[PDB]
Structure 1
Amino acid sequence: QNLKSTDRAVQQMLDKAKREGIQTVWDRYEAMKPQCGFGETGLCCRHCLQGPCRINPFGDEPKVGICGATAEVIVARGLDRSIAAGAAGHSGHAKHLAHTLKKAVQGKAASYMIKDRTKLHSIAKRLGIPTEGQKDEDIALEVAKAALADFHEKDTPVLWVTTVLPPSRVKVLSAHGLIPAGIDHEIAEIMHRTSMGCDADAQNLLLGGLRCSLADLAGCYMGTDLADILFGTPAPVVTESNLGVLKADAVNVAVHGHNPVLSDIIVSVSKEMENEARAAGATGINVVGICCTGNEVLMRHGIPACTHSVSQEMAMITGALDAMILDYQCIQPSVATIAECTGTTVITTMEMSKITGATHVNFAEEAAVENAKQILRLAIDTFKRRKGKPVEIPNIKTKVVAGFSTEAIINALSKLNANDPLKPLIDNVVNGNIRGVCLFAGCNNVKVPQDQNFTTIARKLLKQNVLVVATGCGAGALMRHGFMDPANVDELCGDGLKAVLTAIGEANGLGGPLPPVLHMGSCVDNSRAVALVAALANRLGVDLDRLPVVASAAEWMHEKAVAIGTWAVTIGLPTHIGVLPPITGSLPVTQILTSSVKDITGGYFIWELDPETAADKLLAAINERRAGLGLPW
């Protein structure tokens, strides 16, 4: 079972699933072996009804697509569509939040409001929206309208690219024609250019994909911006993670998906309803998080994280999960079938994300509190039906200190230097206490024993004094293995890094260090790491491709994560990936993405299966950046 997951709670539920005959993601993976080598290498195309076409990676025919498409065109077209799909997910999330903010300040959804007035005004300043003499509701309406305008062509490019990156970076991108004209405009243009008998030049195609990945960055950044306005900017919090946060005597309700627009309301209304749950025999309503919508309410409210990604079925296997409330993205559709065995009420809430066999509740922001009550009452009914039923909740959980928004990080640093908060961080980079910065991002993948790459790489970087920040299911992996617990700083961190975490924590009224890893939030909150790295770059007067900053999508899965990895390279970062993407069938495309993209953006993909080898390559990349600044290493 430790070949499936390094998480001991997950291993325990795998034993239970095995003996109850419940099929899991790992079983479905095993039944799929051996996987198709054409798809694995990227040498398959189904973009027209003359296909499917394939190309032998080596040997005799087929050597070319029926229309004449070469291996390098087929590979670049397939990658481009996965970037566009990722952009469409992060774009759709941001768009829904834009409509919510607009409804809120137009008096149409009273359950929503401007919660962070500081954030609203700083965004409006960043966009060049006039604030002084304006009402908040009119500033916010201007911000929401500007958000919606970035989806289509207009007289400006996408402002959620051009106003978030260092001006030098924008000029480098603009010189290569890489600035997006509109978010949905770029998504559609990718789909057009990759359809049959259109773009057939690998380099032209990949430049389109880099541009589409910045459309995805815009959507990430807009989603983070709008969610902070509506629900508050995260600040440091303490909570717990892993399956042991479930409680047998409570109504256990998981929020699962990505968009917190309803899950933040569920959090609020669930407090309002403890009495109704006590009347059914529960201690209360135990809201817990799965995947990124769980990260959202962990970051803002300290909702304990139940589990993540590949292991999400295991929360049901406990027998104690009474409801699973879904919005969209990364939800294994298997949860709807598994619920018939485990008793869980699986509930979809979004018009464009339904699952056959789940109960659907048509959430509308105008009726959000009423919907949350209808939903939580289904959860209460479910808890009643398992009166007397035995549960197996693994008694396994970790302490999690989280909530490190970029504003929180700057604020924490300001306690060492009030008027120059970034300087203490840069000082310890220069003198070697901080070797560099590594962002862990992206999913788990069934192909990789769960969390194995994240923890192995992080363990080695931390001992080498790398400052480690994490998002999404990378934060999930680290948090479930103790990397967000300050009590483990002594074990995990080098002396230089420990010294810095201790000074910052001691200066923030804690008598203890910051945690070994800084949790910066959900996948769209990868935009927070951009805001931090960009601010560091602007303070040093250099572009991002000169900073000792790297990223590792160590176990990545989703098209969303492919987009993120690509815009990490596009904004200038050495970017490690721990699962082969479908590009090895084309050496020219692999060469572009792993080497020659350096000459365009200064970033590049680092393709490494072995996590120990990956850590060495990440340290080498961090150290080359150090040498380019003339730092010792």
Structure 2
Amino acid sequence: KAKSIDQATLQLLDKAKQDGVETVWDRKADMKVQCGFGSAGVCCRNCSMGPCRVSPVPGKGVERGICGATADVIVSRNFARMVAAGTAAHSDHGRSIALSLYHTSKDGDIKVKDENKLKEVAKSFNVETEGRDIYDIAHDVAKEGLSNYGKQLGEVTLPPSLPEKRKELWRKLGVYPRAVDREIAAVMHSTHIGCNADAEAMIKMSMRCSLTDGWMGSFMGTEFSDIMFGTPHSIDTEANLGVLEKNSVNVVLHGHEPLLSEMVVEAASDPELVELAKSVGADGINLCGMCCTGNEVSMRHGIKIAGNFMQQELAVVTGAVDGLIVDVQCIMPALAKLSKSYHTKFITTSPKAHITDSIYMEFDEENPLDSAKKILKEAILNFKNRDQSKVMIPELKCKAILGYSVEEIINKLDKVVNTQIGPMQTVKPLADVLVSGVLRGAAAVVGCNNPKVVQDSAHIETIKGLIKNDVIVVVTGCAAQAAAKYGLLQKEAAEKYAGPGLATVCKLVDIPPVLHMGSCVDISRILDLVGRVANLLGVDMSDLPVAGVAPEWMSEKAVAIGTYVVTSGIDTWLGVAPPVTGGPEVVDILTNKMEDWVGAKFFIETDPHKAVEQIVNRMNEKRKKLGI
């Protein structure tokens, strides 16, 4: 089968074959037929009595592990641990952001750039703002956010966009969230040998844990990032590997933590570093981003996006990356080995993400700007080691428009508001187009790449099908970057791919049919948006014609995201089967019984066209239930 639908990706794969280096596709081929027990989730290693593998087919073979655990128990515990790991990644990201907010000052490297957003957040956290210094408010808000992570007494703080009905449903179901780290610890405790051996209770614990990701960790990370670095607005950028410059220093920022990439962007305008780039024979400094850190700097500053997850290696294959600076998460360790075949300096910066044989330059949060400057200086000095005979940058780049935060979307919707009617600054125009049926619904396309799927194929096919069916699409993460590379993040795309209702809406509001809402933590924005719509219509989020899709997901973070999206009341389609087919009870819970608990459920569909059809049918069913 084809490795990708992206032509620049194919050219660089040919180059990697010529250079004798191996990619993620080569390692996937080397893995051959993957273990059936692990693929079905019926393998357990939770204690040293094991490893235990039970039959994925009920009634045949070994039925129980040594402790007596059934296939359903093993599957449910494995699924719960995936959710706990994803929640941990997102919560650690949000915790770093909250600590950075706590360390803001007027004359420091980290300031408050959006005071209005900070005051609204302070209102949401019961922090007084009138007649107060802005940094005192910021510190109080950071304290409340940090308490959300580890409070042992009392209730956590949730955003006002979350409907009261959803909160009450969670409380009745027993999944109402506690402090984030406490829920992660609870999930890890209940999967220990000889604890929870009941699939339904295990799934409910995993949902409870995922809620602390969706509504607390990711939400606080996003809002505090907006406070410190600015709320995203409509902005132009370029996407795909063609953004690399042969005649300039190329600095590629890969990872998820935004403070480092923000400081690197600021350092790139330093006169001394620009002069140094000139002195090593380069035209200038060309910052490019990848994955979620690329999404953040692109949403807030228009930094060009070099590529998504499965392109990271190919960025090095060009031979033009002088410095690849990585913080945490979705950083393929093979990069270190790959960096030996080129001049590239592979720089790790976080104590959480040491990588063997990489150059470690710890990013100092006490002096973020100076630390970013020294890291960037190492990348710039590496330009002298460039071998221009090994350089091949495909001439394939695509224009994209992004920056669609909830605030930006509301500002855009204000155009189609009659002044004599109003109100202004609400999601009411979006609610109106959804209720009238001009738009059939809204769908979130999120997730990673996965060698099991032709890279970017499922993302593009799902998005085109949805917008052709007058479903407005919001995108995050690597799916958003696939849309950017393909050319869907363009106003012109409205008349090229969208159906009649969505084309009319795009023309009236002057937006692309696909709205890039940011990184994987920025999925919280989507929740926020949906919540507002629900609160405007006086219904729960499970009554709306909305859906989420993860066509090509790979990470534990994706599992946690899908779990909290379903738990919030939004049906989720998975384009990659999770390791649960071995447990019939777990499959039945996730795809059938979940609708009785939270009004939504998982859909597993590896065919994107069938997924689009199912999404449209489900949205029409919910519309008929709602009367619209």
The TM-score bracket by the shorter chain reads: over 0.9
- C-alpha distance in 1, partners of 2:159/2:423? 26
Residue equivalent to 2:42: 43
Aligned partner of 1:487 among 485, 492, 501: 492
Following superposition, the deviation at residue 157 of structure 1 comes to 2.3
Correspondence 1:419 to 2:423: yes
Correspondence 1:497 to 2:502: yes
Residue equivalent to 2:184: 187
- C-alpha distance in 2, partners of 1:329/1:407? 28
Following superposition, the deviation at residue 350 of structure 1 comes to 0.5
Residue equivalent to 1:457: 462
Aligned partner of 2:258 among 260, 266, 274: 260
Q: Please give the secondary structure, in 1, of the residue aligned with 2:340.
A: helix
Q: Please give the secondary structure, in 2, of the residue aligned with 1:88.
A: helix
Tell me: CA distance 1:295–1:162, structure 2 relative to 1, closer, same or farther (3 Å). Answer: closer
Taking structure 2 as the reference length, the TM-score comes to 0.97
- C-alpha distance in 2, partners of 1:164/1:342? 49
- C-alpha distance in 2, partners of 1:230/1:79? 35
Following superposition, the deviation at residue 162 of structure 1 comes to 5.8
Residue equivalent to 1:102: 102
Counterpart contact for 1:489–1:515, Cα < 8 Å: yes
Q: Please give the secondary structure, in 2, of the residue aligned with 1:341.
A: coil
Q: Please give the secondary structure, in 1, of the residue aligned with 2:56.
A: coil
Q: Please give the secondary structure, in 1, of the residue aligned with 2:31.
A: coil
Residue equivalent to 2:446: 441
Residue equivalent to 2:237: 239
Residue equivalent to 1:522: 519
- C-alpha distance in 1, partners of 2:545/2:321? 43
Residue equivalent to 1:431: 436
Correspondence 1:589 to 2:586: yes
Residue equivalent to 2:276: 276
Summarize deviations over 1:342-388 as a string: whole Å, max 9, x none: 22111011111111111111111222122112111111121111154
Residue equivalent to 2:20: 21
Counterpart contact for 1:127–1:163, Cα < 8 Å: no
The alignment covers a number of residue pairs equal to 619
Q: Please give the secondary structure, in 1, of the residue aligned with 2:283.
A: coil
- C-alpha distance in 1, partners of 2:391/2:187? 49
Matches within 5 A, 1:85-234: 85-105=85-105, 110-159=108-157, 161=158, 163-217=160-214, 218-234=216-232
Summarize deviations over 1:274-327 as a string: whole Å, max 9, x none: 222111111111000100000000000000100011121111100001111111
Residue equivalent to 2:351: 351
- Look up the equivalent residue of 1:492 and give its one-letter code: Y
Counterpart contact for 2:343–2:387, Cα < 8 Å: no
Correspondence 1:609 to 2:614: no
- C-alpha distance in 2, partners of 1:137/1:621? 47
Tell me: CA distance 1:388–1:467, structure 2 relative to 1, closer, same or farther (3 Å). Answer: closer
Summarize deviations over 1:385-436 as a string: whole Å, max 9, x none: 1154341101001110000001100111012225243222222223322110
Summarize deviations over 1:145-168 as a string: whole Å, max 9, x none: 011101123443221x36441111
Counterpart contact for 2:323–2:379, Cα < 8 Å: yes
- C-alpha distance in 2, partners of 1:387/1:39? 44
Counterpart contact for 2:161–2:535, Cα < 8 Å: no
Counterpart contact for 2:104–2:138, Cα < 8 Å: no
- Look up the equivalent residue of 1:182 and give its one-letter code: A
Q: Higher mean Cα deviation, 417-426 or 24-33?
A: 417-426
Counterpart contact for 2:319–2:387, Cα < 8 Å: no
Summarize deviations over 1:128-149 as a string: whole Å, max 9, x none: 2111122111111111001110
Counterpart contact for 1:102–1:144, Cα < 8 Å: yes
- C-alpha distance in 2, partners of 1:380/1:387? 14
Counterpart contact for 1:210–1:570, Cα < 8 Å: yes
- Look up the equivalent residue of 1:274 and give its one-letter code: V
- C-alpha distance in 2, partners of 1:163/1:73? 36
Residue equivalent to 1:74: 74
Counterpart contact for 1:413–1:422, Cα < 8 Å: yes
Following superposition, the deviation at residue 615 of structure 1 comes to 0.7
- C-alpha distance in 2, partners of 1:530/1:238? 24
- Look up the equivalent residue of 2:567 and give its one-letter code: T
Counterpart contact for 2:443–2:549, Cα < 8 Å: yes
Counterpart contact for 1:472–1:521, Cα < 8 Å: yes
Following superposition, the deviation at residue 118 of structure 1 comes to 1.0
- Look up the equivalent residue of 1:561 and give its one-letter code: A
- C-alpha distance in 2, partners of 1:111/1:613? 50
- C-alpha distance in 1, partners of 2:160/2:70? 38
Matches within 5 A, 1:302-341: 302-341=302-341
Counterpart contact for 1:158–1:183, Cα < 8 Å: no
- C-alpha distance in 1, partners of 2:432/2:564? 28
Following superposition, the deviation at residue 83 of structure 1 comes to 0.5
Unpaired runs of at least 5, structure 1: 506-513
- C-alpha distance in 2, partners of 1:135/1:214? 33
Counterpart contact for 1:544–1:571, Cα < 8 Å: yes
Counterpart contact for 1:110–1:366, Cα < 8 Å: no
Unpaired runs of at least 5, structure 2: none
Following superposition, the deviation at residue 215 of structure 1 comes to 1.2
Summarize deviations over 1:57-94 as a string: whole Å, max 9, x none: 12643211110001111000001011010010000001
- Look up the equivalent residue of 1:594 and give its one-letter code: T
Residue equivalent to 1:509: none
Counterpart contact for 1:158–1:179, Cα < 8 Å: no
Counterpart contact for 1:246–1:252, Cα < 8 Å: yes
- C-alpha distance in 2, partners of 1:60/1:440? 39
Residue equivalent to 1:550: 547
Following superposition, the deviation at residue 176 of structure 1 comes to 1.0
- Look up the equivalent residue of 1:537 and give its one-letter code: A
Residue equivalent to 1:4: 3
Taking structure 1 as the reference length, the TM-score comes to 0.96
Q: Please give the secondary structure, in 2, of the residue aligned with 1:104.
A: coil
Counterpart contact for 1:443–1:558, Cα < 8 Å: yes
Summarize deviations over 1:484-519 as a string: whole Å, max 9, x none: 0222221111111011111111xxxxxxxx112000
- C-alpha distance in 1, partners of 2:559/2:549? 12
Q: Higher mean Cα deviation, 416-425 or 321-330?
A: 416-425
Q: Higher mean Cα deviation, 482-491 or 516-525?
A: 482-491
- C-alpha distance in 2, partners of 1:377/1:630? 61
Counterpart contact for 1:157–1:179, Cα < 8 Å: no
Counterpart contact for 1:162–1:170, Cα < 8 Å: no
